[PDB]
Design an enzyme around this catalytic site. Structure first.
Site, PDB file in Angstrom:
ATOM      1  N   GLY A  35       0.487   5.926   0.964  1.00 20.91           N
ATOM      2  CA  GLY A  35      -0.279   7.115   1.373  1.00 20.91           C
ATOM      3  C   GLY A  35       0.604   8.189   1.987  1.00 20.91           C
ATOM      4  N   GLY A  49       0.814  -1.224   0.000  1.00 20.77           N
ATOM      5  CA  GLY A  49       0.000   0.000   0.000  1.00 20.77           C
ATOM      6  C   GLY A  49       0.842   1.266   0.000  1.00 20.77           C
ATOM      7  N   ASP A  70      -2.004   9.159  15.901  1.00 19.62           N
ATOM      8  CA  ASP A  70      -2.827   8.692  14.805  1.00 19.62           C
ATOM      9  C   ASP A  70      -3.478   7.326  15.034  1.00 19.62           C
ATOM     10  OD1 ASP A  70      -4.077   9.122  12.382  1.00 19.62           O
ATOM     11  OD2 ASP A  70      -2.388   8.597  11.190  1.00 19.62           O
ATOM     12  N   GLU A  91       8.693  -6.061  11.033  1.00 20.66           N
ATOM     13  CA  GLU A  91       8.165  -7.415  11.041  1.00 20.66           C
ATOM     14  C   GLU A  91       6.872  -7.480  10.226  1.00 20.66           C
ATOM     15  OE1 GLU A  91       6.159  -6.899  15.488  1.00 20.66           O
ATOM     16  OE2 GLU A  91       7.643  -8.490  15.177  1.00 20.66           O
ATOM     17  N   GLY A 101       3.785   6.822   3.209  1.00 17.92           N
ATOM     18  CA  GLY A 101       4.839   6.396   2.270  1.00 17.92           C
ATOM     19  C   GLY A 101       4.449   5.155   1.480  1.00 17.92           C
TER      20      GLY A 101
END
Ligand SMILES: Nc1ncc(-c2ccc3n[nH]c(-c4cnc5ccccc5c4)c3c2)s1
Length: 273
Positions: free
Chosen positions: A15, A13, A135, A89, A18
């Site tokens: 965003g 992914g 967040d 990990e 990064g």
């Protein structure tokens, strides 16, 4: 240096955080995730014991990296001409909490209790180690589906924990408290508890409670699903308008709705296997 040690796989992914790739450590086949962050996009820098100028994210991850599995472990990192690369990990199989809630809709209270308890343990761990995530949300929580264990990810909006006021914020707006919306001021612990109330509502209702600034400021919580009164009360408590009216982490974990939590392994057997 990075080339031979890790065999790079597909893009997981991307965003504001990064770009993150699946990967395998060549020496011992260990599953990893490989996160690239461009230097130009990093506004928040920090410093190691070494005195080396790194992204704050790296500082925060090293401060929380220990036996505790509630936080994603930083295995290694590397600086490049225009970027930093982080080796983290990777549980297998794994799914993020946003996808998991999207698929199931609202979670049963028993499952939400276990998940939320684990998020609490993990956030307490961060605070213990001097780190504020800033967040906390479903997209920043991974589920190790076999073990039933949750992991916090994405410390790129984080900060060193402190007892004085914060006047910057770059996390997710719909999880940010009314005192930020109104005054661009907040304190770490009480803002975190507010995001946790948003997260808990999200788990048990299948969606977040507020969209617009004015809903956040009004702080009136409507329940769109059937939710027990104890859980409603805990949620309303976490989303109290005045920061000082919010519960401490201790009061949350001593709340009646939080009693008799399942172990992670029990959680996987009943709800994930
Ligand atoms: N936005 C993000 N920042 C860091 C991320 C990250 C960090 C460590 C990870 N380990 N494993 C994963 C991961 C995440 N999402 C997945 C989704 C589908 C399949 C595998 C996945 C692995 C990590 C993601 S995602």
């Amino acid at each position: 240096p990075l080339e031979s040690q890790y065999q790079v796989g597909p893009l997981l992914g991307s965003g504001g955080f990064g770009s993150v790739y699946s990967g395998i450590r060549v020496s011992d086949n260990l599953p990893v995730a490989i996160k690239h962050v461009e230097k130009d996009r990093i506004s928040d820098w920090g410093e190691l014991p070494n005195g080396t100028r790194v992204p704050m994210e790296v500082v925060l991850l090293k401060k929380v990296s220990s036996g505790f599995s509630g936080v994603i472990r930083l295995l290694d990192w590397f600086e490049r001409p225009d970027s930093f690369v982080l080796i983290l990990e990777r549980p297998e199989p794994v799914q993020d909490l946003f996808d998991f809630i999207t698929e199931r809709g609202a979670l049963q209270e028993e499952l939400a209790r276990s998940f939320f308890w684990q998020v609490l343990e993990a956030v307490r761990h961060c605070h213990n180690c001097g780190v504020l995530h800033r967040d906390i949300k479903d997209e920043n929580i991974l589920i190790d589906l076999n073990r039933g264990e949750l992991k916090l990810i994405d410390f790129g909006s984080g900060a060193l924990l402190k007892d004085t006021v914060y006047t910057d914020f770059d996390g997710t707006r719909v999880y940010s408290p009314p005192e930020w919306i109104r005054y661009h001021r907040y304190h770490g612990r009480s803002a975190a508890v507010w995001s946790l109330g948003i997260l808990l509502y999200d788990m048990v209702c299948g969606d977040i409670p507020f969209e617009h600034d004015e809903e956040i400021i009004r702080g009136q919580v409507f329940f769109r699903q059937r939710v027990s009164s104890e859980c409603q009360h805990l949620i309303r408590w976490c989303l109290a308008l005045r920061p000082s009216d919010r519960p401490t982490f201790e009061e949350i974990q001593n709340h009646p709705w939080m009693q008799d939590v399942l172990l992670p392994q029990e959680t996987a057997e009943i709800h994930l296997h």
